[PDB]
Design an enzyme around this catalytic site. Structure first.
Site, PDB file in Angstrom:
ATOM      1  N   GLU A 128       0.105  -8.816   6.034  1.00  0.00           N
ATOM      2  CA  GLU A 128       1.131  -9.846   5.898  1.00  0.00           C
ATOM      3  C   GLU A 128       0.933 -11.179   6.611  1.00  0.00           C
ATOM      4  OE1 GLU A 128       4.549  -7.639   7.137  1.00  0.00           O
ATOM      5  OE2 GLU A 128       4.243  -6.093   5.625  1.00  0.00           O
ATOM      6  N   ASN A 170      -3.780  -6.671   3.150  1.00  0.00           N
ATOM      7  CA  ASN A 170      -2.562  -6.075   2.608  1.00  0.00           C
ATOM      8  C   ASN A 170      -1.374  -7.032   2.691  1.00  0.00           C
ATOM      9  OD1 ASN A 170      -1.349  -3.579   1.516  1.00  0.00           O
ATOM     10  ND2 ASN A 170      -0.280  -3.404   3.483  1.00  0.00           N
ATOM     11  N   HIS A 207       6.544  -3.396  -3.242  1.00  0.00           N
ATOM     12  CA  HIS A 207       7.922  -3.049  -2.906  1.00  0.00           C
ATOM     13  C   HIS A 207       8.777  -3.784  -3.922  1.00  0.00           C
ATOM     14  CE1 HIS A 207       6.847  -0.982   0.693  1.00  0.00           C
ATOM     15  NE2 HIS A 207       6.326  -2.055   1.261  1.00  0.00           N
ATOM     16  N   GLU A 236       1.988   0.468  -0.930  1.00  0.00           N
ATOM     17  CA  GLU A 236       3.280   0.921  -0.397  1.00  0.00           C
ATOM     18  C   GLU A 236       4.370   0.924  -1.469  1.00  0.00           C
ATOM     19  OE1 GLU A 236       4.155  -1.443   3.037  1.00  0.00           O
ATOM     20  OE2 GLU A 236       2.055  -1.390   3.702  1.00  0.00           O
ATOM     21  N   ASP A 238       7.294   1.562  -4.027  1.00  0.00           N
ATOM     22  CA  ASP A 238       8.620   2.133  -4.109  1.00  0.00           C
ATOM     23  C   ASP A 238       9.392   1.160  -4.964  1.00  0.00           C
ATOM     24  OD1 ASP A 238       9.230   0.091  -2.145  1.00  0.00           O
ATOM     25  OD2 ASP A 238       9.059   1.572  -0.560  1.00  0.00           O
TER      26      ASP A 238
END
Lengths: 427, 427
Positions: A128, A170, A207, A236, A238
């Site tokens: 990030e 990432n 996300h 990640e 979801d």
């Protein structure tokens, strides 16, 4: 194989992983699912900066090693998460800047990768680093303030520490190609590859929710990055609401890109999620497979009326009744509204628009009927590739009572048996 | 005043109450809703046998009085629950049988009623005395084993203890006329009225779910009992899934029977419910009014496209796209699926069958778009009688940006102010 997510992904040379919290390794319901379904593990918090180097120079790998050993012993590879990050830095690191900080960052990378040298498949080296302000520029962090080349320095340091590991960058909100942030990252990787900076992959957190929804151009973003010579990974994942279509779409996007190594969902059950409120995962609190689970598995395995295979008759709401509690039955198929079911992304089988196929309990013999839709697990179903329809809450199959084939034969929940009175065909 | 449930019920001479738990009186979120919306209170557990007579002959009213004092300080009446019951009996009483039990039952009634003499509107004298086995007969309990006349004796005792109170028999699963239980209770009341046994009302607990769904014949059940010369009351209302239609229907059934005294829902917020997993109440865990709250309120007060009154334009999904994240706007009304909205029992505004009007946030200026339906509160809406559409999660109104009346004007969430750009009409 094709019964579990990991095995089905493995068929195309990919992996299906999850995030593991060492705190739940004692919970058997948790480990049972995690051990069976996934073949890639990311430590949720255990390999973070604060966790691995609580005090400068003093490294602690207790929690990280617990997750790592569990993973390897259960046949899973591991993704290291994460070496340099503006967030969750231990207090000692927050009290640094300039050359001193740069040096600390380097020491931490060598310290962690050295401990895990040769045994981590991919490392999220830098996490990030870009901003969300729509500029597509880097975020102002103590790390960024040490020098714009810190990211490059981190990757070079990483490559030196462990050449066997794939080094990834990432980030979240870099999934939509049109976003200024996606462009910012793309341009950096482009540059890195031009200048020979050691970067092997780009991890897309994925996300998704109504604030940052999934867009079909995600396949385009993945393809554009892969065209630069880097592997891509969904790290990640979801999705708020766990829409079956969206989960299947993201899965197919990875499968359409040869450089897409695999997919990692961020947690096992909804209750394990950092966003449990969004019921964003593939298994619910009870540990039962959601409708999305089946959509994902079916995607990995390859690529109206509901007619009973054994009877040749359709699922029907008696006399087009709309009253709650009306038990459904088998009847000669005809083009009527009381025979038209819509399988929603939530996993419901709706009739008349707002009535749902409903199970009045969880045992064999349980009456299957219609009731107002409200989102209960007893109104969620899994349409399996074998033709069976399984209730999410019960885990039982729709069953034409007593194997009856005539009009009026009732439907109940019953132990799945691959019988023809349990096999359906959507038309 | 037609703005709160109690005040709205009072417009037809009825009340609207709730069950109050004394342990929650210190929670202002809880009491703010409770003191405002209801005008009748039932103590959830505090007036039960175990709570009021912990040891034989030693009565304790500390807990019951905390519920009572609060109720009267806040202008509410009170329903006493409950004097004789096979459940939750204190240890000393569970050990009793025969004439010893019978006398203890009498003593308990005299003790509790004496303390609350003249202060209680209704008392559930006997609770749940009928069996669920389908015989329509009495439940086998220590009380029933003292002799069949125990119910009659409890009523005769209560009348003398406090002749000012309405004395009710209270039970569940006696709402559907066709059930054996319902008719078993009907016969008992008929017998009592003809023999002069003092009974003034029958309480229908009304716990509806998919195993025991509401049935429209509930209105004939209510009429059948009222015809016996007893008043009827809905005492512990809760509906699995909190369907707006069902909640409105039950409400209209009470309003259709002149002897229906009022309705008590069993709890304040969904999280206060004994069946919270079913989200069966009118306020969610956050203390926000659900879609059902609006349906009930509208029913007490007397009770396709969506046109913005200020623009005469319809709520429109740009280019008829089905992509999550597409913001809605105003556009010339016309028959198009992208202009057809279905308001569901859960409170969703569906378009295309499985896309839902969605708020990507809770603040002013928040964007309103479409997103896969999943049941989040940010996808739930209340359609008020004054034409506004309020988001359940935010409490904000659908607002046409800037007052824009032209095609393309975007919809956002904004503080409700009943402007023309916040009033909508359906077609």
């Amino acid at each position: 194989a094709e019964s579990t997510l990991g095995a089905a992904a493995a068929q195309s040379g990919r992996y299906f992983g999850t995030a593991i919290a060492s705190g739940k390794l004692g919970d058997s319901a948790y480990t049972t699912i995690a051990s069976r379904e996934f073949n890639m593990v990311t430590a949720e918090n255990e390999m973070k900066i604060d966790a691995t180097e609580p005090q400068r120079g003093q490294f602690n790998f207790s929690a990280g090693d617990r997750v790592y050993n569990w993973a390897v012993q259960n046949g899973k590879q591991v993704r290291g998460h994460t070496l340099a990050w503006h967030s969750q830095q231990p207090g000692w690191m927050q009290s640094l800047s300039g050359s001193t900080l740069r040096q600390a960052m380097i020491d931490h990378i060598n310290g962690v990768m050295g401990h895990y040298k040769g045994k981590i498949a991919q490392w999220d080296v830098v996490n990030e680093a870009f901003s969300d302000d729509g500029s597509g520029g880097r975020r102002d962090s103590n790390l960024q303030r040490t020098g714009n080349d810190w990211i490059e320095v981190a990757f070079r340091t990483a490559r030196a520490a462990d050449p066997a590991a794939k080094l990834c960058y990432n980030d979240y909100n870099i999934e939509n190609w049109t976003w200024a942030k996606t462009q910012g990252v793309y341009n950096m990787v482009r540059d890195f590859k031009q200048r020979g900076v050691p970067i092997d992959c780009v991890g897309f957190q994925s996300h998704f929710n109504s604030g940052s929804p999934y867009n079909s151009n995600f396949r385009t973003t993945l393809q554009n990055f892969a065209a630069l010579g880097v592997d891509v990974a969904i790290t990640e994942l979801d999705i708020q609401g766990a829409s079956s279509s969206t989960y299947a779409a993201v899965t197919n996007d990875c499968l359409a890109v040869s450089r897409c190594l695999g997919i990692t969902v961020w947690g096992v059950r909804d209750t394990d999620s950092w966003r449990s409120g969004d019921t964003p995962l593939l298994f619910n609190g009870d540990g039962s497979k959601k409708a999305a689970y089946t959509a994902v598995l079916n995607a990995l395995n390859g690529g109206g009326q509901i007619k009973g295979v054994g009877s040749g008759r359709c699922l029907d709401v008696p006399n087009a009744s709309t009253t709650d509690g009306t038990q459904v039955q088998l009847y000669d198929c005809h083009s009527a509204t009381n025979q038209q079911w819509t399988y929603t992304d939530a996993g419901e089988l709706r009739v008349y628009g707002d009535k749902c196929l409903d199970a009045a309990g969880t045992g064999n013999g349980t009456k299957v009927q219609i009731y107002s839709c409200w989102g209960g697990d007893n109104q969620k179903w899994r349409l399996n590739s074998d033709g069976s329809i399984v209730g999410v809450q019960s885990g039982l199959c729709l069953d034409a009572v007593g194997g009856g084939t005539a009009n009026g034969t009732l439907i109940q929940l019953y132990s799945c048996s691959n019988g023809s009175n349990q096999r359906w065909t959507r038309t």
